[PDB]
Design an enzyme around this catalytic site. Structure first.
Site, PDB file in Angstrom:
ATOM      1  N   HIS A  41     -14.501 -19.258  13.790  1.00 14.58           N
ATOM      2  CA  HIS A  41     -15.436 -20.491  13.507  1.00 14.58           C
ATOM      3  C   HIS A  41     -16.250 -20.190  12.162  1.00 14.58           C
ATOM      4  CE1 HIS A  41     -18.552 -19.393  16.288  1.00 14.58           C
ATOM      5  NE2 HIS A  41     -17.438 -19.228  17.183  1.00 14.58           N
ATOM      6  N   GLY A 143     -26.764 -17.598  13.960  1.00 12.41           N
ATOM      7  CA  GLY A 143     -26.299 -16.382  13.009  1.00 12.41           C
ATOM      8  C   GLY A 143     -26.069 -15.194  14.042  1.00 12.41           C
ATOM      9  N   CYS A 145     -23.755 -15.015  16.112  1.00 13.46           N
ATOM     10  CA  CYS A 145     -22.212 -14.854  16.537  1.00 13.46           C
ATOM     11  C   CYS A 145     -21.376 -13.808  15.747  1.00 13.46           C
ATOM     12  CB  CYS A 145     -21.646 -16.366  16.008  1.00 13.46           C
ATOM     13  SG  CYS A 145     -21.892 -17.758  16.966  1.00 13.46           S
TER      14      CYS A 145
END
Ligand SMILES: *[C@@](O)(c1nc2cc(Br)ccc2s1)[C@H](C[C@@H]1CCNC1=O)NC(=O)[C@@H]1[C@@H]2[C@H](CN1C(=O)[C@H](NC(=O)C(F)(F)F)C(C)(C)C)C2(C)C
Ligand SMILES: *[C@@](O)(c1nc2cc(Br)ccc2s1)[C@H](C[C@@H]1CCNC1=O)NC(=O)[C@@H]1[C@@H]2[C@H](CN1C(=O)[C@H](NC(=O)C(F)(F)F)C(C)(C)C)C2(C)C
Lengths: 306, 306
Positions: A41, A143, A145
């Site tokens: 993503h 942030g 991820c």
């Protein structure tokens, strides 16, 4: 003496963290050899994330649309592909600090260290357990991820987790490094919930053994039990079943302390039925289940890495 | 969301750990620039440690009696001096992995990360506080001496702690990197007991703010108090006095949550006078005092390093 929640030293992983940017979306990536792994993503905007068609989004992307930054080193991307919920960006430079590594899928109950990162930079390190409901009780913000979880065996890093999302009660979900989720979660911003969690029995037993080793012995009683009678009580208290494999894995601690696993289970049974009476064990007023038998041994025997 | 005991990334310190050997005694050393720092009792045998005459033990030794190893490689010792309870060995090679660094002497209540090491190799990393009684609640075994504690701010490592010894009840004592003990301890195997410990009030309040930020708000009560009245309650519960400097340091968290410091004190007062009645805050059944106000903001705002 003393017993602390202890993370692996993070140096080998710190040298693998990069920043991956696509459009206005930035998250963390892991750089091993000539491949950068990150959540797929990274190709979404916060509008896309509500319901992404990842294949459709990916068709419109080209190598140059992926900005990869390793400290201040800009990496040239020369290929990309998706694998499950992970993107693999081929880069034209191998990471000179790649450690010995493998990818592993861990099981519920097993622990690992998380290196929480923002913008390709480390914020901190802490130890987590894969819960029975396939969540982790982490500490993660926007942030984070692409931050990874890992174990170290001497010089070899076992990567088991990449961070993707947070679930309602402030617990966290993500994937193995092949991009397959732990649990039935999906990489979409749509209502999802963790199942009922349960307590990791083998781990609590390990920790009771750590307590004995440290001279915290008040909960040892004069009873024994059977695996089957113990499991009856476990299930009514929403503890995982204890298997013969758990008994086997507890053997080192059992042998070290001279306390039969089944005798320790009987001590645990009393603790569950009667509570702790406001007492503590190794500083805690609850029963701790995020230390594996291996974690206790490593810590009590001073096992080193690197 | 989520709130964990988070250690600093340890990579910067991992690159400074060495082994120092004098005779048959080996412990950990810290190699910064062209100096290696280690506990002075590297010059002791097990027999010397009841009541070592460090002067007499040292005066015999020459540069060549000190073996410094980093990995496989011997460093040539070209000078030595003793400063307080630390030895400083000048070597002929500056550490190529030396970070930006300073030495700081921390105050009670301040936290830091420990990189526990054996034989010059890392075993793990965890967060501790300097207790009011000048001990730390560590996890250390034989061979851990010389392991250090530190903070990172941006790219700068502030070294604050070097490990020397374990006191009764399984808590730990050591020095700053100038060799000055925290608290009234001495580096001899003699009867030493820590003073009665107290609870770091300002830290508990910080963690209560962390709890609110994470949605755990059950303990917010309907009262306020004065600093004077609160401090009478703290004294009764063996909590440290709260000062106006502490109130000021809590300003940021106060302003973020819209909860006046004195209103949080009043909520804490209620927790102290009524107990928690089996409830948890941030997953703990006890009030946690090993997060500073800075720790909370760092974690809740995702500050990075490196
Ligand atoms: C992560 O770091 C990512 N951030 C972004 C930002 C953009 Br524009 C694109 C892609 C990503 S991936 C965060 C980490 C989490 C933020 C708060 N704490 C975290 O651990 N991941 C996310 O924001 C993911 C991401 C999008 C929605 N989401 C969520 O974590 C949440 N969950 C859910 O919707 C639900 F399934 F309900 F649990 C959210 C934001 C907390 C509501 C996807 C899953 C792809
Ligand atoms: C450390 O690693 C060191 N080991 C050695 C071994 C030799 Br042959 C020489 C010098 C050193 S320094 C340990 C660490 C501790 C062991 C158990 N857990 C620890 O953290 N430090 C010590 O052994 C120090 C050391 C000698 C005695 N001691 C102690 O830690 C304790 N001393 C005390 O009596 C007390 F005062 F209570 F603190 C001990 C051994 C636990 C009884 C000195 C203080 C110089």
């Amino acid at each position: 003496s003393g017993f602390r929640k202890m993370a692996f030293p993070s140096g080998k992983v710190e040298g693998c963290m990069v920043q991956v940017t696509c459009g206005t979306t930035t998250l963390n990536g892991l750089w091993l050899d000539d491949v950068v792994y990150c959540p797929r993503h990274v190709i979404c905007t916060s509008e896309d994330m509500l319901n992404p068609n990842y294949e459709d989004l990916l068709i419109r992307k080209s190598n140059h649309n992926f900005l990869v930054q390793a400290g201040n080193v800009q990496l040239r991307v020369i290929g990309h592909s998706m694998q499950n919920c992970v993107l693999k960006l081929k880069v034209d430079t191998a990471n000179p600090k790649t450690p010995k590594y493998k990818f592993v899928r861990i099981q519920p109950g097993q622990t690992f260290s998380v290196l929480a990162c923002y913008n390709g930079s480390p914020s901190g390190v802490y130890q987590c357990a894969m819960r029975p409901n396939f969540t982790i009780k982490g500490s993660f913000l926007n942030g984070s991820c692409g931050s990874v979880g890992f174990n170290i065996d001497y010089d070899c890093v076992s990567f088991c987790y990449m961070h993707h999302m947070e679930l309602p009660t402030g617990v966290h979900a993500g994937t193995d490094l092949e991009g397959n989720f732990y649990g039935p979660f999906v990489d979409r911003q749509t209502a999802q919930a963790a199942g009922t969690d349960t307590t990791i029995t083998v781990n609590v037993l390990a920790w009771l053994y750590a307590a004995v080793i440290n001279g915290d012995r008040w909960f040892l009683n004069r009873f024994t039990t059977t695996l089957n009678d113990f499991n009856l009580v476990a299930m009514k208290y929403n503890y995982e079943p204890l298997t013969q494999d758990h008994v086997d894995i507890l053997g080192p601690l059992s042998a070290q302390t001279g306390i039969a696993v089944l005798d320790m289970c009987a001590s645990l049974k009393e603790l569950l039925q009667n509570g702790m009476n406001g007492r503590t064990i190794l500083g805690s007023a609850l029963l701790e289940d995020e230390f594996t038998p291996f974690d206790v041994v490593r810590q009590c025997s001073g096992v080193t890495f690197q």
